[PDB]
């Protein structure tokens, strides 16, 4: 599973999966 | 499992998985 | 498992896995 | 398991695993 | 297990595992 | 097990394992 | 919870050229 | 919890050229 | 918990050229 | 817990060229 | 717990060239 | 616990060239 | 007699204020 | 007689204020 | 007689203030 | 007679203030 | 008679203040 | 008669203050 | 006598008499 | 006598008499 | 007599008499 | 007599008489 | 007599008489 | 008599008489 959970985000959130 | 949990993020959060 | 848990992050958090 | 736990981070946290 | 636990971090914390 | 525990870190903490 | 926040995020190339002067008196 | 925060994040190349002068009196 | 924070994060190349002068009097 | 923090983080190459002068009087 | 902190972190190459002068009087 | 801290951390190459002078009077 | 002349004469007070910037990205 | 002349004459007070910057990225 | 001349004459007070910078990244 | 001349004459007080910097990365 | 001349004459007080720096990385 | 001359004449008080530095990394 | 004679004047010519 | 004679003047010529 | 004679003046010529 | 004679003046010529 | 004779002046010529 | 004779002057020539 790939899950991103964010609360009160004022910044930058970068999530990446490369095969 | 790949999980990112963030609260009150004002900075930069970079998460990456490369194969 | 790959887990990143962040609270009150004002800095930079870099997490990477390379194969 | 690979786990990163951060609280009140104002600095730089770099975590990497390379094979 | 690979675990990083940080509280009130204003400096730089670098953790790496290379094979 | 590989564990890093830091509290009130203003300096530099470098931990590395190389095989 | 009270939040007063000024936030700026940038992700693109920025080029700026400024010239001030070349006045003859 | 009270937060007053000024936050700036940059991720792109930035080029700046400034010239001030070349005035003849 | 009261937080007053000024935070700056940079991740891109920055080039700056500044020239001030070349005035004839 | 009261926090007053000025934080700066840099991760990119920075080039700066400054010239001040070349004035004729 | 009261914290007043000025923190600077650098991780990139920095080149700085400064010239001041070359004035004729 | 009261903390007043000025902290500087550096990890990158730094080159600095400074020239001051070459003035004719 | 051939004359090609650019001539500028000034006799009055001159005030100049210039602001360039204050851009948020 | 051939004359090619650039001439500038000044006799008055001159005040110049220049601000370049204050950009947030 | 051939004359090529660049001439500058100044007789008044000159005040110049320049600020370049104050950029947050 | 061939004359190529660059001439500068100054007779007034000159004040110059320059600030370059104060950038946070 | 061939003359190539660069001439500078100064007769007034000159004050110059230069500040370069105060950058946080 | 061929003359190539660079001439500088000064007759007034000159004050110069230069500061370069105060950078935190 | 007060006499000002000018030919091909591109500059500034200031003549004054004050008693 | 007060006489000012100028030819091909590109500069500044200031003549003054004060009593 | 007060006489000023100028030819091809590109500079500054200041003549003054004060009593 | 007060006489000023100038030819091809690119510099500064200051002549003054004060009593 | 007070006489100033100048030719091809690129410098500064200061002549003064004070009583 | 007070006489100043200058030719091809690139320097500074200061002549003064004070009583």
Numbering used by the authors:
A (entry chain W), B (entry chain S), C (entry chain O), D (entry chain K), E (entry chain G), F (entry chain C), ...: 14 to 32
G (entry chain U), H (entry chain Q), I (entry chain M), J (entry chain I), K (entry chain E), L (entry chain A), ...: 13 to 37
Authors' text:
Islet amyloid polypeptide (IAPP, or amylin) is a 37-residue peptide hormone that is cosecreted with insulin and one of the most amyloid-prone sequences known. Overproduction and aggregation of IAPP leads to amyloid deposition in the islets of Langerhans, a pathological hallmark of type-2 diabetes. Although the precise link between IAPP aggregation and disease remains uncertain, IAPP aggregates have been shown to be toxic in cell-based assays, and genetic and animal studies implicate islet amyloid in the progressive loss of pancreatic β-cell function. Over 40 different proteins, with diverse native structures or in many cases intrinsic disorder, form amyloid associated with human disease, yet all amyloid fibrils share a common cross-β architecture consisting of a continuous intermolecular β-sheet supported by networks of zipper and ladder-like interactions. Amyloid fibrils have a similar cross-β architecture, but fibrils formed by a single protein sequence can have diverse structures, varying with time, self-assembly conditions, and sequence modifications.
Cryo-EM was performed on fibrils assembled from 30 μM IAPP in the same buffer used for kinetic assays (160 mM ammonium acetate, pH 7.4, 1% v/v DMSO), in the absence (4 replicates) or presence (2 replicates each) of 50 μM YX-I-1, canagliflozin, or doxazosin. Fibrils with a similar morphology were observed for the control (no small molecule) and doxazosin-containing samples, with the majority having a twisted ribbon morphology and crossover distances of 60–100 nm. Following helical reconstruction, multiple distinct IAPP fibril polymorphs were resolved, revealing further detail on the apparent morphological differences between the samples. The majority of fibrils formed in the control (69%) and doxazosin-treated (72%) samples were classified into three related fibril structures (named LL, LLU, and LLUU, respectively), which have a shared structural core consisting of a pair of protofilaments related by a 21-screw symmetry. Each protofilament is formed from a single stack of L-shaped IAPP subunits, with straight β-strand segments encompassing 13ANFLVHSSNNF23 and 25AILSSTNVGSNTY37-NH2, hinging on a turn at Gly24. In addition, further flanking subunits presenting U-shaped IAPP subunit conformations and ambiguous β-strands were observed adhering to these two β-sheets, with the combinations of these flanking subunits differing to generate the three individual polymorphs LL, LLU, and LLUU. Thus, out of the fibril structures that were identified in each data set, YX-I-1 fibrils consisted of 89% C-fold subunits, whereas this subunit fold was absent from fibrils grown in the control or with doxazosin. By contrast, the control and doxazosin-treated samples consisted of L-fold (62% or 72%, respectively), U-fold (34% or 28%), and S-fold (4% or 0%) subunits.
